[PDB]
Write an enzyme that holds these catalytic residues in place. Structure first.
Site, PDB file in Angstrom:
ATOM      1  N   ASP A   1       0.771  -1.240   0.000  1.00  0.00           N
ATOM      2  CA  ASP A   1       0.000   0.000   0.000  1.00  0.00           C
ATOM      3  C   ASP A   1       0.808   1.299   0.000  1.00  0.00           C
ATOM      4  O   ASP A   1       0.573   2.164  -0.840  1.00  0.00           O
ATOM      5  CB  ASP A   1      -0.989   0.002   1.174  1.00  0.00           C
ATOM      6  CG  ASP A   1      -1.901  -1.222   1.176  1.00  0.00           C
ATOM      7  OD1 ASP A   1      -1.938  -1.951   0.161  1.00  0.00           O
ATOM      8  OD2 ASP A   1      -2.593  -1.453   2.192  1.00  0.00           O
TER       9      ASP A   1
ATOM     10  N   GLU B   1      -9.283  -2.534   2.681  1.00  0.00           N
ATOM     11  CA  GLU B   1      -8.918  -2.199   4.054  1.00  0.00           C
ATOM     12  C   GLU B   1     -10.126  -1.565   4.732  1.00  0.00           C
ATOM     13  O   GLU B   1     -10.460  -1.890   5.871  1.00  0.00           O
ATOM     14  CB  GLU B   1      -7.747  -1.215   4.069  1.00  0.00           C
ATOM     15  CG  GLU B   1      -7.235  -0.892   5.468  1.00  0.00           C
ATOM     16  CD  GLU B   1      -6.282   0.289   5.483  1.00  0.00           C
ATOM     17  OE1 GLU B   1      -6.755   1.439   5.368  1.00  0.00           O
ATOM     18  OE2 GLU B   1      -5.062   0.071   5.600  1.00  0.00           O
TER      19      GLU B   1
END
Length: 255
Positions: free
Chosen positions: A51, A161
């Site tokens: 990420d 997420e």
């Protein structure tokens, strides 16, 4: 249905065009900076993970293009390393991003100081809570840097997420602008591949639920009930993390 409701709320798509999504993110960042000329830098925490590596690359690209196009030499992307005490992944990520500036801030000192103050008050923290305290200390560090460099804090939050709510409220969830929001996990890998990112840098979760299950769910596919039920439970339970502080006017938490 509930699944279709989550998909819409997070803006996830079954499939995406890598080149197009790279562009949307970069122009978004560029457009934001141009609308607020007093902003001079983008600040992001680098962990060596997928990420932040992808987010970091997209930030440097936005800054590189702005410099060429506007001639503004003061714009800069600042990558921040926030180790707890004491990293080849971080080094590899940095080498791939090639940031204008890299700062290293050790948060251990501050965390222990916070715990000592709590201890004197009669409160001993558990490892679980300590994990959140760390995430929040990292948030404080990035905002202090941004405060001194006329910058905004970039976050790595994305669809895979946001759905589970597996992030610290006001910790790594405390950011200003999130260029990855809408993308699931595998789609993130897709963008990194298109950017020629080193493979070992991007190639599970909990309760036997894997990112594949989560991404499949996000892509609108059918998944086993035990998996889909767990995923939906996390979502509903963490709704307060994806919303501003609750007031007498909210009802999403009722019943």
């Amino acid at each position: 249905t509930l699944q279709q409701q989550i998909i819409k709320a997070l803006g996830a798509k079954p499939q995406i065009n890598a080149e197009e999504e790279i562009r949307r993110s970069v122009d978004f960042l560029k457009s934001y900076l141009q609308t607020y000329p007093f902003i001079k830098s983008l600040v992001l925490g680098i962990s060596g993970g997928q990420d932040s590596t992808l987010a970091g690359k997209l930030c440097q690209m936005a800054i590189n293009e702005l410099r060429l196009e506007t001639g503004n030499e003061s714009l800069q992307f600042i990558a921040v390393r926030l180790p707890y005490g004491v990293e080849q992944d971080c080094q590899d990520a940095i080498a791939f991003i090639q940031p204008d500036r890299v700062l290293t801030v050790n948060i251990k000192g501050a965390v222990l100081a916070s715990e000592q103050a709590l201890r004197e008050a009669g409160i001993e923290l558990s490892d679980f809570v300590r994990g959140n305290e760390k995430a929040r200390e990292r948030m404080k560090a990035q905002y202090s840097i941004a405060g001194m460099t006329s910058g905004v804090v970039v976050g790595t939050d994305h669809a895979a997420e946001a759905i589970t709510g597996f992030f610290t409220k006001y910790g790594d969830g405390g950011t200003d602008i999130n260029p990855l929001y809408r993308l699931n996990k595998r789609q993130g890998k897709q963008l990194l591949a298109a950017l020629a990112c080193p493979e070992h840098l991007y190639k599970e979760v909990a309760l036997g639920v894997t990112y594949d299950n989560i991404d499949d769910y996000l892509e609108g596919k059918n998944v086993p009930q035990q998996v889909a039920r767990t995923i939906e439970n996390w979502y509903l339970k963490t709704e307060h993390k994806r919303r501003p502080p609750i007031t007498v006017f909210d009802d999403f938490w009722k019943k």
